[PDB]
Amino acid sequence: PILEKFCFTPHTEEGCLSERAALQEELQLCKGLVQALPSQQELPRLLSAACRLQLNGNLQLELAQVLAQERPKLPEDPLLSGLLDSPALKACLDTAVENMPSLKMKVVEVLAGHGHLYSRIPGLLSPHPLLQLSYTATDRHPQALEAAQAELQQHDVAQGQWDPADPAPSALGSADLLVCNCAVAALGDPASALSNMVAALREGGFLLLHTLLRGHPLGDIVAFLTSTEPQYGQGILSQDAWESLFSRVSLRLVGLKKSFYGSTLFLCRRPTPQDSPIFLPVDDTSFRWVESLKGILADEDSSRPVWLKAINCATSGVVGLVNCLRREPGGNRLRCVLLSNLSSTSHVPEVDPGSAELQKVLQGDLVMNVYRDGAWGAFRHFLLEEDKPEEPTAHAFVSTLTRGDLSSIRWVCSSLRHAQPTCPGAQLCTVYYASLNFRDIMLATG
Numbered sequence: 001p002i003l004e005k006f007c008f009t010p011h012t013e014e015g016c017l018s019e020r021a022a023l024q025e026e027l028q029l030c031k032g033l034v035q036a037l038p039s040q041q042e043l044p045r046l047l048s049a050a051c052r053l054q055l056n057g058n059l060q061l062e063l064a065q066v067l068a069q070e071r072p073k074l075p076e077d078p079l080l081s082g083l084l085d086s087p088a089l090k091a092c093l094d095t096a097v098e099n100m101p102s103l104k105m106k107v108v109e110v111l112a113g114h115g116h117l118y119s120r121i122p123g124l125l126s127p128h129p130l131l132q133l134s135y136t137a138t139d140r141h142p143q144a145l146e147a148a149q150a151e152l153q154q155h156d157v158a159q160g161q162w163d164p165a166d167p168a169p170s171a172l173g174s175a176d177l178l179v180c181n182c183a184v185a186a187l188g189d190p191a192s193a194l195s196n197m198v199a200a201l202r203e204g205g206f207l208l209l210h211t212l213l214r215g216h217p218l219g220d221i222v223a224f225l226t227s228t229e230p231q232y233g234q235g236i237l238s239q240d241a242w243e244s245l246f247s248r249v250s251l252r253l254v255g256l257k258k259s260f261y262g263s264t265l266f267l268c269r270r271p272t273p274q275d276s277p278i279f280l281p282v283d284d285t286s287f288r289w290v291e292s293l294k295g296i297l298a299d300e301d302s303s304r305p306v307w308l309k310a311i312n313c314a315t316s317g318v319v320g321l322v323n324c325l326r327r328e329p330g331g332n333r334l335r336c337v338l339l340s341n342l343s344s345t346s347h348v349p350e351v352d353p354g355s356a357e358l359q360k361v362l363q364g365d366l367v368m369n370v371y372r373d374g375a376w377g378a379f380r381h382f383l384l385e386e387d388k389p390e391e392p393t394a395h396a397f398v399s400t401l402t403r404g405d406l407s408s409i410r411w412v413c414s415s416l417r418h419a420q421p422t423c424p425g426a427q428l429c430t431v432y433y434a435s436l437n438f439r440d441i442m443l444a445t446g
Contacts, residue, residue, distance in 0.1 A: 010375040018260050096267070212263060
């Protein structure tokens with residue numbers, strides 16, 4: 001079975017990867033070499049080599065090229081792939097999958113050669129049972145990505161030739177989701193690249209962009225390097241600079257996941273033709289609202305969206321309602337809004353049409369719009385840690401978690417935690433030495 005957990009996931013988050021210890025040590029090391037102008041990780045090795053050849057007046061060329069760095073091991077770096085390893089990537093992909101009119105998804109990657117997202121993305125979408133996916137990986141030059149062709153073949157991915165600088169080929173055409181991974185891959189021009197991408201992007205589609213933000217420690221550290229390749233320098237821009245860039249291409253920001261050190265994951269959507277929305281209270285206890293909703297949905301000729309908003313109680317199951325309806329005919333028009341604060345202290349924002357918050361969410365246009373403790377987000381599914389929980393217990397017995405495999409012998413909590421000492425026939429006894437007989441071996445071996 002596939003095991004998962006159903007949790008609230010705020011749209012905009014900061015300091016995502018604080019918990020990890022390895023990343024913090026990597027950051028401390030990296031800043032150390034930078035200071036005054038040491039690990040198995042690549043980027044620290046690159047910085048050490050850069051500082052090694054000269055303590056001052058380092059050549060851009062020599063640091064640009066060096067043994068053990070010519071490979072695309074930078075994406076293999078923990079820091080550069082950190083947020084991609086987090087649940088942030090799965091959250092963004094789930095948001096992209098949910099907000100699709102149809103059950104099929106056409107996702108095209110730009111500069112797949114260095115981004116390497118092609119390996120990670122298709123696996124993350126295996127849990128979705130009914131989804132059908134069509135991935136294509138594109139690069140500026142065919143000889144790039146000439147390797148790992150077995151890796152592409154084992155999955156269902158398609159090569160590509162689009163150079164983000166120029167307009168996308170009609171073969172790609174309109175696609176639901178575009179993934180770039182600009183962190184390691186270089187974009188020739190921010191404005192032009194984004195313009196071409198949004199052009200290729202269908203209406204109501206998503207543009208998932210992973211980038212390193214200038215104005216942050218790691219951002220400046222990388223900015224010093226890669227001075228030989230001007231393009232990659234253009235791939236580094238300020239957060240406010242990105243915010244300005246998105247507006248220029250009339251692309252609305254829908255999501256943002258920001259790491260403690262600077263790695264970010266922008267999610268922006270291609271605005272759909274504006275249309276008058278319908279608002280139907282779905283809070284009545286008598287369930288009389290069904291008749292009205294059954295009506296509004298009835299007029300299939302119309303194309304206006306429908307917004308089911310419940311604000312009276314935090315126990316409305318409107319999310320499941322919209323999930324089941326979107327599979328029914330006419331359900332594409334449905335979009336939900338739920339205000340479910342788990343703390344009485346937290347205030348309830350006003351969702352009246354006049355209020356700003358409703359305008360902002362309407363601009364978002366996401367199907368699921370849940371508000372909990374002052375943060376707009378949606379429930380998401382996440383695979384749970386494979387490891388079995390352990391607790392400090394004074395009672396435990398040796399058990400074979402897999403019949404016939406002595407490697408599975410482990411200590412498990414016991415029923416003796418609950419016992420009564422009064423009974424003379426009980427005589428609970430502590431154990432200091434226990435013997436193994438032939439029968440125990442026969443049992444364990446199977």
